[PDB]
RNA sequence: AAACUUUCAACAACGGAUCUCUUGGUUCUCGCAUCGAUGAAGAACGCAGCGAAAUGCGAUACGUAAUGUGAAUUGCAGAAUUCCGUGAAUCAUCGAAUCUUUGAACGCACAUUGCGCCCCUUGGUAUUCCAGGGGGCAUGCCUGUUUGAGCGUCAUUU
């Protein structure tokens, strides 16, 4: 249970904050968990997902589907992964969204900021 | 006997009740003290690559600067190695600015995008005219400055 008075357990307020979060907060909201191998390697349970992360689906109709992220649609609260698509009847391939909470991060796109955030959260590369 | 009319069921018909939902209300509580002549609240007109609104903004116009974050924005399309970075973003923060015409609204007017006046600059062989760029000219009151007025009144005058 909550103890502090600045935390609100009101469903209406929490839902409004989620649905009207700006993109900076949606980045944290769209965090994805690392695989078991990456969790062992880094020491990080989960990270905010990025554009070039290699990701594996662990839940849904595309379980066990690998693929590098193609976009982080923060407006739609989703991520778009290459080769995870739907072939329309006209033949066009459209992206299929899915939540990063249903994914596992299998390869990190590392830059200076990602590595610094890993050390911040307690990782060691 | 049919058609027609009534009743019931099935399916199909505008209707949008019911059910479930809910970024909205409404009450209660706690904390705080912050509008404006340094131009407010409000109004008008404009600003997006493709748009007119309680979106945001002002000719620096869906915004500039500074800061934080750290890779987006996204309906479509795009300047660009913008991606191990003084750096994406309809991001957050926000202390620097810009802030059109107005509005208590301030040169005089205002059912007019109407008329002046004063400085400095530029152009027209120009201190006077015209034009352009910039900066100004409200009222009441206070303190001070300067210039005054009044046999209201003080120190010199046959």
UniProtKB/Swiss-Prot annotation:
Q: Which PROSITE patterns match?
A: RIBOSOMAL_L24 (PS01108)
Recorded GO cellular component terms are:
cytosol; cytosolic large ribosomal subunit
One function term, GO molecular function aspect? RNA binding
Q: What does the UniProt keyword field contain? A: Cytoplasm, Ribonucleoprotein, Ribosomal protein
**GO BP term (any one):** ribosomal large subunit biogenesis
Pfam family name, one:
Ribosomal_L26
InterPro entries, alphabetically? Answer: KOW, Rib_uL2_dom2, Ribosomal_uL24_CS, Ribosomal_uL24_euk/arc, Ribosomal_uL24_KOW, Translation_prot_SH3-like_sf
Predominant location: cytoplasm
Q: Where in the cell is it found?
A: Cytoplasm
Q: Does the keyword RNA-binding apply?
A: no
Q: Which NCBIfam families match?
A: rplX_A_E (TIGR01080)
Q: What else is known?
A: There are 2 genes for uL24 in yeast.
Q: Report quaternary structure and partners.
A: Component of the large ribosomal subunit (LSU). Mature yeast ribosomes consist of a small (40S) and a large (60S) subunit. The 40S small subunit contains 1 molecule of ribosomal RNA (18S rRNA) and 33 different proteins (encoded by 57 genes). The large 60S subunit contains 3 rRNA molecules (25S, 5.8S and 5S rRNA) and 46 different proteins (encoded by 81 genes).
Q: What does this protein do?
A: Component of the ribosome, a large ribonucleoprotein complex responsible for the synthesis of proteins in the cell. The small ribosomal subunit (SSU) binds messenger RNAs (mRNAs) and translates the encoded message by selecting cognate aminoacyl-transfer RNA (tRNA) molecules. The large subunit (LSU) contains the ribosomal catalytic site termed the peptidyl transferase center (PTC), which catalyzes the formation of peptide bonds, thereby polymerizing the amino acids delivered by tRNAs into a polypeptide chain.
Provide the family line: Belongs to the universal ribosomal protein uL24 family.
Q: What is this protein called?
A: Large ribosomal subunit protein uL24A
Native source organism of the sequence: Saccharomyces cerevisiae (strain ATCC 204508 / S288c)
From the broadest rank down, the organism's phylogenetic lineage runs: Eukaryota, Fungi, Dikarya, Ascomycota, Saccharomycotina
